[PDB]
């Protein structure tokens with residue numbers, strides 16, 4: 359009997375952030391509280407003393423950070439408005455200004471969030487789904503939350519993945535997002551600084567389960583080069599991985615590890631192929647002590663393997 | 673999708689009652705309200721005006737009836753107590769007495785309910801899971817609510833199916849309940865009016881997905897004879913049925929119909945092999961309009977066949 363694991367909501371939203379191998383993982387408990395687990399040389403926390411806020415039961419959970427100096431965690435209120443819990447080093451946790459804006463979204467909306475890459479400025483872009491079923495970008499550039507670009511129609515309840523990177527030869531940040539459309543395909547939308555939003559949808563998978571989880575990362579930004587990894591729960595009840603590798607494009611897709619039916623998914627990465635990396639970490643529920651969150655590991659030494667069997671508080 | 677279907681909670685609890693082919697189906701909308709869809713010659717209702725109460729988001733939903741003259745619907749409060757919405761013919765809906773007893777159960781608890789068969793009296797047995805993860809029976813015999821028999825440990829957050837029937841050569845009701853044990857097996861416990869609860873767990877399936885939905889019915893009671901069907905979501909993302917048939921015992925098991933990953937399941941039945949039945953109706957989510965509730969049908973005319981594609985309000 360595992361009372362810690364029982365505290366984790368079955369099919370909880372999962373988010374994660376890191377600065378290299380210093381890790382934080384956010385999940386919802388059975389009372390709807392959002393808890394933090396931590397890895398600093400070893401795993402710790404995720405107890406009822408480690409609550410950073412509350413949200414509607416079954417809320418999406420997204421997170422983004424600048425190393426571990428600035429963290430932001432996004433969930434839905436009971437009123438189906440976006441809200442934000444902020445960490446700043448030297449300040450600690452507090453309620454962020456997103457809530458005050460009262461952005462009404464679909465009750466079944468998911469959320470994705472990024473800090474724009476390649477600047478020390480605190481610039482945020484959030485993605486969620488309006489009641490008309492369109493994907494809307496919400497922006498912070500230091501003087502008030504505002505609506506950004508609307509990205510058009512999606513499957514109601516679609517998962518949303520997002521990443522920002524800055525090519526080392528470019529003067530500004532790039533954004534990529536992924537969601538599912540009404541034909542059930544999983545698709546990419548792309549922002550470059552000299553182009554804005556590309557007009558076209560690029561398909562990364564032909565038929566995925568409806569409202570499947572979608573999580574994304576990128577690493578190894580070079581001169582007009584990037585590496586990206588996208589993950590979703592396929593109809594075989596495993597997480598699949600779609601690979602973008604510089605010079606190969608979208609050239610591989612395949613299963614990675616079993617999950618529970620309807621598992622949510624989070625991804626973090628650090629390093630690069632050029633410098634004896636990258637490291638990858640996935641987080642999901644695969645049924646360990648029934649409801650615990652489990653970890654998957656990719657590194658250069660031993661490749662693909664299962665990491666922590668059961669995260670705190672399990 | 674459709675605006676109507678969007679209001680149905682993805683992976684909602686489902687329950688159903690009937691008097692022969694006069695049908696009622698209960699489900700949870702995205703706001704946490706419990707709604708009723710109706711079949712009287714055709715399908716109707718399931719809108720915001722067809723709400724019988726509110727329950728915590730993601731609550732189990734169970735319902736039992738004596739024909740359509742008395743219906744009881746059971747869910748969890750926000751404080752993880754058992755509650756009851758009652759319908760009596762010529763009284764209407766009201767809040768049933770159960771909530772006042774403040775029966776505290778595990779936040780991840782499911783619920784099953786039955787009116788004891790073969791009497792006129794309103795006798796009820798409710799099954800849910802205590803915080804110590806044991807399955808507890810809760811009784812009403814016309815003289816207040818009280819705890820009945822404890823039936824021991826089960827998987828935290830187990831599904832629970834239950835049925836009551838009366839062997840025609842007996843002056844009293846039998847009860848059968850199904851749930852999932854800590855070893856991930858699916859098991860039966862049994863109550864007969866002479867022997868009480870038999871000490872032994874009977875295995876109906878060797879290993880099922882953690883916290884899989886479990887729904888059961890029985891029909892065609894005779895002298896020392898009975899037929900029963902147990903439904904669950906197997907790892908192949910489909911509903912499986914386990915058959916008890918008089919003289920064959922537990923002799924057949926197999927897939928019936930595909931569902932979304934982690935779909936809930938409800939079953940109703942009427943009639944008998946003896947008289948050009950029985951009739952079966954399964955309710956579940958299969959991805960029709962993304963989040964609408966669909967129906968499967970068994971009858972003697974056509975056999976296994978899909979029924980209503982999308983219940984109201986889709």
Ligand SMILES: CC(=O)N[C@@H]1[C@@H](O)[C@H](O[C@@H]2O[C@@H](C)[C@@H](O)[C@@H](O)[C@@H]2O)[C@@H](CO)O[C@@H]1O
Nearest residue numbers: 696708710712740741743759760761762763
């Ligand atoms: C006394 C009588 O026959 N009344 C009927 C109602 O029962 C019926 O209500 C519907 O069915 C009941 C069992 C519940 O499910 C209600 O929510 C339904 O509205 C209404 C509508 O047909 O008709 C009479 O009032």
Ligand SMILES: CC(=O)N[C@@H]1[C@@H](O)[C@H](O[C@@H]2O[C@@H](C)[C@@H](O)[C@@H](O)[C@@H]2O)[C@@H](CO)O[C@@H]1O
Nearest residue numbers: 744756758767768769770794795796812814
């Ligand atoms: C004899 C009689 O008519 N008694 C009724 C009760 O049945 C009724 O209670 C409800 O119905 C029962 C079966 C349980 O489900 C209770 O928890 C319900 O409250 C009440 C309605 O208030 O009225 C009489 O006591």
Ligand SMILES: CC(=O)N[C@@H]1[C@@H](O)[C@H](O[C@@H]2O[C@@H](C)[C@@H](O)[C@@H](O)[C@@H]2O)[C@@H](CO)O[C@H]1O
Nearest residue numbers: 430442444453454455456480481482498500
């Ligand atoms: C210039 C500066 O540092 N201003 C901070 C501002 O960043 C804080 O706002 C928070 O963090 C930002 C990036 C968003 O997530 C906001 O929604 C959030 O409130 C603000 C906190 O009150 O304090 C300013 O000094």
Ligand SMILES: CC(=O)N[C@@H]1[C@@H](O)[C@H](O[C@@H]2O[C@@H](C)[C@@H](O)[C@@H](O)[C@@H]2O)[C@@H](CO)O[C@H]1O
Nearest residue numbers: 839848860862864870874895896897898916
């Ligand atoms: C008429 C009678 O008493 N028959 C019993 C039968 O009820 C017992 O079997 C139980 O009931 C059936 C429906 C299944 O649920 C069985 O798995 C369950 O054990 C049986 C006990 O072995 O004994 C018969 O006499």
Ligand SMILES: C[C@@H]1O[C@@H](O)[C@@H](O)[C@H](O)[C@@H]1O
Nearest residue numbers: 379397639653655665666
């Ligand atoms: C950064 C660390 O990497 C490996 O050592 C894993 O076993 C840990 O859980 C953690 O992910």
Ligand SMILES: C[C@@H]1O[C@@H](O)[C@@H](O)[C@H](O)[C@@H]1O
Nearest residue numbers: 382394396426427429445
């Ligand atoms: C970056 C910070 O690191 C630790 O001090 C944690 O206790 C905080 O909650 C936060 O994760």
Ligand SMILES: C[C@@H]1O[C@@H](O)[C@@H](O)[C@H](O)[C@@H]1O
Nearest residue numbers: 483495506507531533549
């Ligand atoms: C980084 C860019 O910033 C603004 O110009 C937005 O309107 C775009 O949507 C994009 O997010």
Ligand SMILES: C[C@@H]1O[C@@H](O)[C@@H](O)[C@H](O)[C@@H]1O
Nearest residue numbers: 534546548560584586602
């Ligand atoms: C990293 C790459 O960036 C642009 O070239 C896109 O058109 C590609 O689809 C890919 O996203």
Ligand SMILES: C[C@@H]1O[C@@H](O)[C@@H](O)[C@H](O)[C@@H]1O
Nearest residue numbers: 587599601636638656662
């Ligand atoms: C970073 C690694 O890149 C390739 O080696 C993939 O096959 C691995 O799964 C991993 O994504």
Ligand SMILES: C[C@@H]1O[C@@H](O)[C@@H](O)[C@H](O)[C@@H]1O
Nearest residue numbers: 693711953967969979980
């Ligand atoms: C009793 C009725 O049976 C069939 O006609 C189904 O098509 C209906 O939806 C209903 O279940």
Ligand SMILES: C[C@@H]1O[C@@H](O)[C@@H](O)[C@H](O)[C@@H]1O
Nearest residue numbers: 797809811820821847863
């Ligand atoms: C029908 C029976 O009623 C009482 O005797 C309960 O204690 C039993 O558990 C059973 O529910």
Ligand SMILES: C[C@@H]1O[C@@H](O)[C@@H](O)[C@H](O)[C@@H]1O
Nearest residue numbers: 901913915950952970976
């Ligand atoms: C009443 C019927 O019983 C058997 O024939 C099963 O094969 C059917 O699926 C149905 O359960």
